[PDB]
Amino acid sequence: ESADLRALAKHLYDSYIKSFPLTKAKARAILTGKTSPFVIYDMNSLMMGEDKIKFKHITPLKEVAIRIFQGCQFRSVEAVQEITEYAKSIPGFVNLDLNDQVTLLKYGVHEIIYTMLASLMNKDGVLISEGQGFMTREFLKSLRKPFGDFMEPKFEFAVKFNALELDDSDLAIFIAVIILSGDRPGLLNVKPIEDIQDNLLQALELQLKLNHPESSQLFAKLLQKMTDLRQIVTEHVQLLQVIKKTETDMSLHPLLQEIYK
Amino acid sequence: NPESADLRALAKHLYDSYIKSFPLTKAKARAILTGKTTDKSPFVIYDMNSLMMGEDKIKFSKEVAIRIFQGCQFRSVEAVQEITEYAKSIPGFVNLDLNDQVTLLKYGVHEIIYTMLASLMNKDGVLISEGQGFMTREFLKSLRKPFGDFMEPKFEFAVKFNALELDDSDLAIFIAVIILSGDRPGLLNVKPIEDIQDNLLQALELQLKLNHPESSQLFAKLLQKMTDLRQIVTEHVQLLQVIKKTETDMSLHPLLQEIYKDLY
């Protein structure tokens, strides 16, 4: 039965490598610099960034702050398809009621986005467009209200999350645990969701004990980060509402709005 | 073999996403139309009195032709939203230039709507209100001009298209092929779209061979139907230009207005 959890851990790792092109391992090599990304530290470097590197997130289709915000949304929609593909590789997931599969992804993708975004962040900035770019924390903070404090909470979360020093093999199982949450609203058959998560939690616990034997109660500490993630998502939703209500320059092509709803 | 295996995985992925995106499948539509059951029986609207009773029996301007026309607008906007949700699930679609995403949906959505409207149709009429209702082909043709001419060419297409006997698993890949069309006016990067469609076309070819082994050149026959769809759009566009001018008191939903703005 111990061999079964190690097999599940390996399976999830291999699937995570297939689904997510920019791994934490690769992201960290770039951030520390064991290899070079184009740095966006102000408006002039942003302009040169667009011009030279052609970020599909920033492509013209207007105020810089809004074009950065909309770039974040375009990337978020990309990430949802990578996560959806990963979810299908989790043993039991495809066998669930199809409405429940949709429900788990609907409520799970935000938590997963901010988990995996930590992998691309240090205290100084964030890797963008598959590690070709590095946007500074200070530059994001300098954006006019309310866009100035849109990324800052993610940075504060990331710095603390990154202190757990998890690797891709740890994260693969943690992300699977997040997807198989039996407390999501509107679920029809909670039992086989909790049975799969119970199995993933067992796999995650062995993985952290074998991978991080010196790291006392790392399992407990990682599960506590669920609190930090759900608060980040609740907080982010509350910022979207403020934006939709008080900003008059957010409008895109109506089909564009539908895609990136 | 490994090549085949990847195309079956893609087929399975697209069918799963199709069931998740489209609440009323062909399988459910046929079960309602073939009227075998006691629980799935639709209320049938064939005249003005039947329509007026339908208003109560089913859960949804004054003039009858207009109420139907604007009801059809609301549903068409809802279908656009479902098709947009489906498009995002097509591997590679959300990774394309954002302008090309908008362009592919702009030209793709109505071709898909008419393809999928075939599923809700037999030679005698069309399912409405998530299959709770059935509106007869005769009632729709009897409507004051030019409103009587909107649905007839859709029915004509549907009776021919339905003779191919496609199921939802076939249709999931076919509508994917329609969206990823490299020949849409004003596409910026044609190559990556063609590369996705080539893989989708390989997936469709295998799907039809395995699912319809006795159906000779079904692949070729299905691809030729994309000619009929383009044709339905052209006629529809011309018919809307007439309404715009004759009914100055009537409003076209902004999303549809945008889709048709500078179309061809």
Numbering used by the authors:
A (entry chain B): 207 to 241, 245 to 270, 275 to 474
B (entry chain A): 205 to 264, 274 to 477
Excerpt from the paper describing this PDB structure:
The nuclear receptor PPARγ is a pivotal transcription factor regulating mammalian adipogenesis and adipocyte functions. The protein kinase CDK5 can phosphorylate the serine (Ser) 245 residue of PPARγ.
For a precise comparison, the crystal structure of ligand-free PPARγ LBD under the same condition with butyrolactone I-bound PPARγ LBD was also determined at 2.1 Å resolution. Both the structures were determined in the same monoclinic space group C2 with nearly identical unit cell parameters and were similar to each other with RMSD of 0.53 Å over 513 equivalent Cα atoms.
